[PDB]
Write a protein that binds this DNA or RNA. Structure first.
Ligand code: TTP
Ligand code: CA
Ligand code: CA
Ligand code: CA
Ligand code: CA
Ligand code: CA
Ligand code: CA
Ligand code: CA
Length: 901
DNA sequence: TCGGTAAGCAGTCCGCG
DNA sequence: GCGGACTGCTTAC
């Protein structure tokens, strides 16, 4: 097999690399890598090296990496550009793996771990590590085993061994319900004392050294805790054994409000799963507890235990250990579903970076572009300092707030990367500038043609047309990967709908789910077999189709994110190729494209309808348009349609056979106007929306920019078994909105769009009557909580104190003098409830850590004093008033002359 | 929250005769 | 009461 790296580090004048050799073995080597950098040279000097602008460069070979770094400094002192890859480990990887890397995940040691630490005096701070580590569960992907290290004797209590037999039993048998499928994979090791536990853990770590290290909050908690605890007990040298090269560094992570410390383990790639999840999941959750996320992702119930976690080991060590094991497994289950580790390996190996660098698109693109240019003996420019400067982005049309009955939407494929490719936007393809007219003049095609030679953007920029720039070349490669995975995602989605349809008529039989590849549209044969399957088999197939859809979604949306990241990286001062000329060329072209096609679509539809100045495009945001289809439907007449699906088919056909060709013609003209390199503005139909045929549903409504709801029957070619609400921006979509309130508002919207005013009024009346019975957590608001300290004046709200911060301050007074009470953590999320006048808490609201029950110390008083009237008005009525006024509907029945009867 | 812009709503403070 | 200036937070793209 072809070799591939696992990890790489620079330590002084050495590269330390762990890798898989040609025989599939893990090896480590130390290499005295001599790096090269570049200076510009006279044209009279023969060279094969040229900078991206075609200027000749001489290669400087250094005796060692320190010399190269010192040279960079002296070049700054002189005032001359020092060209080339200054991150020498990336240059090392580029030289050592000068081919497309094919990696074998089965040879990569991926470790998932979690620790337990009993703490009687509050949160056990990892920088202090003053409490014993009393459990570690460490799963190894190569062994496929959960290694459990269990401390039996501690100053906080001596306990009996954990029982695998009790662990396996149902919770109804008094067991812990450790999943049967991992029971045979547990290797249990009890310890007489913590020193022996940790010494054996380190020996184990030496034998089975993680390449990828993950878990939940491992970077912020588990790793620094283990490191600092071992340091405290044994000294620094022993703690550094967590690194295969015995090198660690405290790294200070800074944000706007303060800083925190993590431990960098040289020769390990830490991918904390909480951070993978935050980056790659495209959710915003009210809590990031593993409990909360596991329930969301897997539909597994909360891990139940009595009393505080600080007393769990002494009261129920059996459950304590089982829950530690289950916690590690839950992350594995989340990854089996989401496949973020797979994604990270794919992207990291593609770019030729340390795997942990996938968190940074700037670093990822720096490496991709460097490797690409190096192939042509081209030389990358030096990174430079730039002041942060604001620049313009997308256009968003102001909609007329209203109901909108029939709506077809259209959206441009991968807009920003497609603009880069079409215009040929790259650092080295800049050709010059032209004199700009107001944007409106380009939109209406009255401005003079910018250039007859170069490819243009309406920001004034001109680009070469003779050859693709490196940015277009490389962005295209990742776009093509994205397109492939999106194809799989949509097939799995369509396949899912086939199965949902079949589930209307399940067969009474005992059978098996079909062995099929859900990434490809089901054949006629598979379809016929599905129609004969039991509900059991169909539901299993549906689960599998949905899992395939999720895998496709991960792979496509994050490749989309990567390529979009390149567009914005051009506007990030830390990117080697930062250039606001290029960043603005993208965004300004985007504004033009949207408003240009708005004009073209209005002109086309006024022509088909035989009208003048009528606005068919009701809304657009960045690269989408929403078209009112009422007039199209009315031209055949609602009474001609057999059912909802009939008019959906009709609009689908109209969009594909009439509108898309018109749109294409409009964009081809725009391409010629800007003299672009290649026409790549592909705007395809997205949604078909409307009320069910014969209903009083309103179909859709807008309240303003980025705030709308549509009843969708078909989305990008997926014809739904049941209509799906597409709601954007409204409170149903906001993590700050109480859970039960999101649910209620969604049902109000569903009724509005599908059933009509009377249905809405019926539901509103019921919700208003019954909502006080809702669990307090389900009706609590949610907010991130920053700068608690800033607004804290002696335990009380300072000037301009935000509402949620006031709530935290109230909580802090109510729990004062309790080291055991859960503390609100700066920067994390809280639940927030309003409090009635005259409550014992002395203020109008209270807040506590999100994803948790409020401490029993104050729970009953919170429940007693919760202000239901305020909560309802703020989170439910006010947003509903907004929806209904926009939709020109009433949520309460108005008096009429009929009431006299 | 270590890892591009546009733009909405909650809430504080305070004006608005 | 509502709206502007401002802070804070959140989502759409
Ligand atoms: C969603 C999203 C969009 N954008 C920018 C870049 C996108 O090209 C542009 C339009 O957004 P989108 O229409 O959401 O995405 P897209 O056009 O890139 O891809 P798709 O084929 O799925 O429609 O907005 C971001 O910068 N970050 C983001 O997270
Ligand atoms: Ca735990
Ligand atoms: Ca798009
Ligand atoms: Ca059937
Ligand atoms: Ca879009
Ligand atoms: Ca098309
Ligand atoms: Ca203070
Ligand atoms: Ca206001």
């Amino acid at each position: 097999m072809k070799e591939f790296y696992l990890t790489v580090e620079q330590i002084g004048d050495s590269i330390f690399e762990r890798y898989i050799d040609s025989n599939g073995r893990e090896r480590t080597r130390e290499v005295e890598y001599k790096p090269s950098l570049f200076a510009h040279c006279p044209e009279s000097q023969a060279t094969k090296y040229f900078d991206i602008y075609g200027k000749p460069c001489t290669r400087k070979l250094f005796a060692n990496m320190r010399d190269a770094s010192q040279w960079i400094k002296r070049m700054e002192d002189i005032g001359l550009e020092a060209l080339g890859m200054d991150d020498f480990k990336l240059a090392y990887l580029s030289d050592t793996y000068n081919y497309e890397i094919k990696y074998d995940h089965t040879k990569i040691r991926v470790a998932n771990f979690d620790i337990e630490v009993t703490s009687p005096d509050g949160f056990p701070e990892p920088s202090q590590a003053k409490h014993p580590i009393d459990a570690i569960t460490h799963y190894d992907s190569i062994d496929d085993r959960f290694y459990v290290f269990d401390l039996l004797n501690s100053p906080y209590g001596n306990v009996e061994e954990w029982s695998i037999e009790i662990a396996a039993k149902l919770q109804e048998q008094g067991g812990d319900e450790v999943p049967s499928e991992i029971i045979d994979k547990i290797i249990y090791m009890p310890f007489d004392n913590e020193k022996e536990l940790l010494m054996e853990y380190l020996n184990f770590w030496q034998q089975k050294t993680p390449v990828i290290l993950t878990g939940w909050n491992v970077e912020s908690f588990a790793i620094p805790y283990v490191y600092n605890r071992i340091k405290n007990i044994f000294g620094e040298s022993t703690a550094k054994r967590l690194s295969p090269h015995r090198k660690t560094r405290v790294k200070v992570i800074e944000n706007m409000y303060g800083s925190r410390e993590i431990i960098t383990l040289f020769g390990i790639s830490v991918l904390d799963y909480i951070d993978l999840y935050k980056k790659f999941s495209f959710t915003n959750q009210p809590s990031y507890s593993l409990d909360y996320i596991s329930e969301f992702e897997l539909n597994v119930g909360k891990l139940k235990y009595d009393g505080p976690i600080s007393k769990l080991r002494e009261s129920n060590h059996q459950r304590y250990i089982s829950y530690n094991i289950i916690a590690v497994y839950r992350v594995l289950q989340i990854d089996a579903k989401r496949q973020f580790i797979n994604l990270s390996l794919d992207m990291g190996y593609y770019a030729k970076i340390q795997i942990q660098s996938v968190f940074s698109p700037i670093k990822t693109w720096d490496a991709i572009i460097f490797n690409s240019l190096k192939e042509q003996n081209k030389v990358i420019p030096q990174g430079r300092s730039h002041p942060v400067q604001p620049y313009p982005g997308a256009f968003v049309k102001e909609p007329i707030p209203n109901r909108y009955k029939y709506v077809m939407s259209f959206d441009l494929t991968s807009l920003y990367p497609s603009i880069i490719r079409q215009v040929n936007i790259s650092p080295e393809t800049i050709a010059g500038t032209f004199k700009v007219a107001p944007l409106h003049d380009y939109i209406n095609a009255v401005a003079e043609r910018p250039s007859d030679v170069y490819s243009c953007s309406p920001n004034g920029m001109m680009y070469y047309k003779d050859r693709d720039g490196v940015v277009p070349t490389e962005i295209t490669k990742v776009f093509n990967q994205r397109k492939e995975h999106k194809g799989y995602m949509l097939a799995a989605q369509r396949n899912g709908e086939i199965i949902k349809e079949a589930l209307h008529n399940p067969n009474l039989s005992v059978d098996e789910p079909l062995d099929v590849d859900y990434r490809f549209d089901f054949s006629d044969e598979i379809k016929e077999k599905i129609k004969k399957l039991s509900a059991k088999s169909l539901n299993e197939m549906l689960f599998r189709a949905q899992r395939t859809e999720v895998a496709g979604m991960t792979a496509q949306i994050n490749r989309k994110a990567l390529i979009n990241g390149l567009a914005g990286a051009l506007g990030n001062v830390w990117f080697r190729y930062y250039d606001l000329r290029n960043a603005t060329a993208i965004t300004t072209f985007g504004q033009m494209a949207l408003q240009w096609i708005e004009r073209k679509v209005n002109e086309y539809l006024n022509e088909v309808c035989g009208t003048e100045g009528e606005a068919f495009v009701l809304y657009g945001d960045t690269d989408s348009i929403y078209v009112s289809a009422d007039k199209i439907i009315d031209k055949v007449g609602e009474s001609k349609f057999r059912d909802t699906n009939h008019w959906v088919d009709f609009l689908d056909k109209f969009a594909r056979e009439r509108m898309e060709p018109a749109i294409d013609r409009g964009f081809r003209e725009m391409c010629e106007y800007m003299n672009n390199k290649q026409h790549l503005m592909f705007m395809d139909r997205e949604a078909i929306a409307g009320p069910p045929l014969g209903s009083k549903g309103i179909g859709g409504f807008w309240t303003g920019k980025k705030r709308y709801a549509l009843n969708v029957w078909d989305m990008e070619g997926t014809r739904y078994a049941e209509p799906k609400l597409k709601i954007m921006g409204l409170e149903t979509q906001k993590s700050s909105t109480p859970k039960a309130v999101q649910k209620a508002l969604k049902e109000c919207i569903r009724r509005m769009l599908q059933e009509g005013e009377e249905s809405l009024q019926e539901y509103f009346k019921e919700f208003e009557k019954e909502f006080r019975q809702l669990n307090y957590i389900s009706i609590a608001s949610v907010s991130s909580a920053n700068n608690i300290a800033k607004y804290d004046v002696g335990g009380f709200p300072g000037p301009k104190c935000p509402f949620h911060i006031r709530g935290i301050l109230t909580y802090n007074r109510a729990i004062k003098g309790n080291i055991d009470a859960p503390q609100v953590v700066e920067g994390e999320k809280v639940y927030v409830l309003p409090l009635r006048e005259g409550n014992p808490f002395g203020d109008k609201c209270i807040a506590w850590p999100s994803g948790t029950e409020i401490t029993d110390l104050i729970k009953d008083d919170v429940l007693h004093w919760m202000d239901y009237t305020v909560l309802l008005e703020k989170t439910f009525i006010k947003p509903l008033e907004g929806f209904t006024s926009a939709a020109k509907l009433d949520y309460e029945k108005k008096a009429s002359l009929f009431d006299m009867f």
